A paper describes a structure:
Organic Cation Transporter 1 (OCT1), a member of this family primarily localized on the basolateral membrane of hepatocytes, is involved in the uptake of cationic molecules for hepatic metabolism and excretion. The structures also show a large extracellular domain (ECD) between TMs 1 and 2 unique to the SLC22 family.
In OCT1-DTZ, a pendant ammonium group was close to E386 likely forming an electrostatic interaction. The aromatic groups in OCT1-DTZ were both located near F32, W217, Y361 and I446 which maximized hydrophobic interactions, whereas the additional methoxyphenyl moiety of diltiazem was proximal to W364. Polar interactions between diltiazem and Q241 further stabilize the ligand in the binding site. The hydrophobic pocket of OCT1, with a specific charge coordination through E386, likely favors molecules with a pendant ammonium cation tethered to a large lipophilic or aromatic core. On the other hand, the structure of OCT1 in complex with diltiazem (OCT1-DTZ) showed this compound formed electrostatic interactions with E386 through its pendant ammonium cation. Compounds with cationic ammonium pendant groups tethered to an aromatic or hydrophobic core pose significant risks as high-affinity inhibitors of OCT1 as seen in OCT1-DTZ.
Author numbering: 19 to 287, 331 to 514
Write the structure that this text describes.
């Protein structure tokens, strides 16, 4: 067999594109850059933990990290009258009376590597642009979920697949060379236009190469290829501390695999949209399936982004959480053939919602319990997604199955568009608000799931 390994490699290469923002876009601690502070520190011998205390504005009640991240004291540090023990005491009687200003002179990031945030200065006022990086990719997924069918209708299937692979590889390689943010967003959108199209085309091909009597195992293996790709992305991210190097090391393997994938012997081998709603039972099924797809995509992406934004040891937490899918995949494989798909999916959704709810009250120092809860939630959502990827095949007849899959999977992309703004922006108002929303969505999805036959 040759198609199996190469198609699993193709599926594994989709993971760094989808969840790569966790390592390409990490946000280190930062503060306003102020000239003259370096020379004063050299004169006074200030350690980094001492300079970060003397100059950068301190934390207020309940944290309030904004005053240090986006503001600075407008004081002429060049004056020699400043005391080496404490320069702020010679300025004014009260520290709160000193003038305040934005980071006009730049930023200082406490990290040896770099990311898009550290290079394009997507912090404070510009910090809302980081969500746009994922939103553009999800918009590309949404557009490719509808344009790829027409493209493959007007063009040869294998040639269209080859063209999409080539375009994806070229776009991924080109992104690492972007000189500014707008061009990078253009390449991100172009890559997202073809990434999900390639994934679905590979799914269809791998389900065609094996008869309908064994599609489950094939689909589960294709899914676990994504977990293998996540593990490889974690390894590469640990090895390479800069985002351009990681982008090259991610995109290049696909292009080189294209050089080896010229031709293989097994390669060359109307329903109406209104029909889904004219009948009450099918309308109910379509509504429930759309809601479940949206909720599961929101929960999965939100959990990964929250882990990326809040975990204190990102590499090990990502490595642990990624490995839990494989036991989840095996659990799903055992469960489907024995006790059906409805109850297991409902229980997985309930477990995910409960895990989201419990995680709110955990103190920050209990990292060993927080990671266990995160792993449980990830296993729950993984099992739920595995179940829902197979239930759709039964409720829809072959006459309208492909249209139903295309329609239902389109809401996942809208959820992907909405999700970054929920995770990143609502966290400003209250750190527990995204967790509350995720818990509510998970519990509601668990409740509604019982209605499916
Ligand atoms: C009918 O066949 C399909 C297959 C896959 C999907 C999307 S593709 C996607 C895009 C971005 C992030 C994750 C995913 N994964 C992969 C999940 N991993 C555990 C493998 C899904 O399963 C998505 O569906 C969801 C979210 O429920 C839709 C329809």
């Amino acid at each position: 067999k040759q198609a199996f390994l190469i198609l699993c490699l193709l599926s594994a290469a989709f993971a760094p594109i989808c969840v790569g923002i966790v390592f390409l876009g990490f946000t280190p601690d930062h503060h306003c850059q102020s000239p003259g502070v370096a020379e004063l520190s050299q004169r006074c011998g200030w350690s980094p933990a001492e300079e970060l205390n003397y100059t950068v504005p301190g934390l207020g009640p309940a944290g309030e990290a904004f005053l240090g991240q986006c503001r600075r004291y407008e004081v002429d540090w060049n004056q020699s009258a400043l005391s080496c023990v404490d320069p702020l005491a010679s300025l004014a009687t009260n520290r709160s009376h000193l003038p305040l200003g934005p980071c006009q002179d730049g930023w200082v990031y406490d990290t040896p590597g770099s990311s898009i945030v550290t290079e394009f200065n997507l912090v404070c006022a510009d910090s809302w642009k980081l969500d746009l990086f994922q939103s553009c990719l999800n918009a590309g997924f949404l557009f490719g979920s509808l344009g790829v069918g027409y493209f493959a209708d007007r063009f040869g299937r294998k040639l269209c697949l080859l063209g999409t692979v080539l375009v994806n590889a070229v776009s991924g390689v080109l992104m690492a060379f972007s000189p500014n943010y707008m061009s990078m967003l253009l390449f991100r959108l172009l890559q997202g236009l073809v990434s999900k199209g390639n994934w679905m085309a590979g799914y269809t091909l791998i389900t065609e190469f094996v008869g309908s009597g064994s599609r489950r195992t094939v689909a589960i293996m294709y899914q676990m290829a994504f977990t293998v790709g996540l593990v490889a992305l974690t390894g590469l991210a640990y090895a390479l501390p800069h985002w351009r190097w990681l982008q090259l090391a991610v995109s290049l393997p696909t292009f080189l695999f294209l050089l080896y994938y010229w031709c293989v012997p097994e390669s060359p081998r109307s329903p109406s949209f209104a029909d889904l709603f004219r009948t009450p039972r099918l309308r109910k099924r379509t509504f429930i399936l759309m809601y479940l797809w949206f909720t599961d995509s929101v929960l999965y992406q939100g959990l990964i982004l929250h882990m990326g934004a809040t975990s204190g040891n990102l590499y090990l937490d990502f490595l642990y959480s990624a490995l839990v899918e494989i036991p989840g995949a095996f659990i799903a494989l055992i469960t489907i053939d024995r006790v059906g798909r409805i109850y297991p999916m409902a229980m997985s959704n309930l477990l995910a919602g409960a895990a989201c709810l419990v995680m709110i009250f955990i103190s920050p120092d209990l990292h060993w319990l927080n990671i266990i809860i995160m792993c449980v939630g990830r296993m729950g959502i993984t099992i739920a997604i595995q179940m829902i990827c197979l239930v759709n095949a039964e409720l829809y007849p072959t006459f309208v199955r492909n249209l139903g899959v295309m329609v239902c999977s389109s809401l996942c992309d809208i959820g992907g568009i909405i999700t970054p703004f929920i995770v990143f922006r609502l966290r400003e108002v209250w750190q527990a608000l995204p967790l509350i929303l995720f818990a509510v969505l998970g519990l509601l999805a668990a409740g509604v799931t019982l209605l499916l036959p």
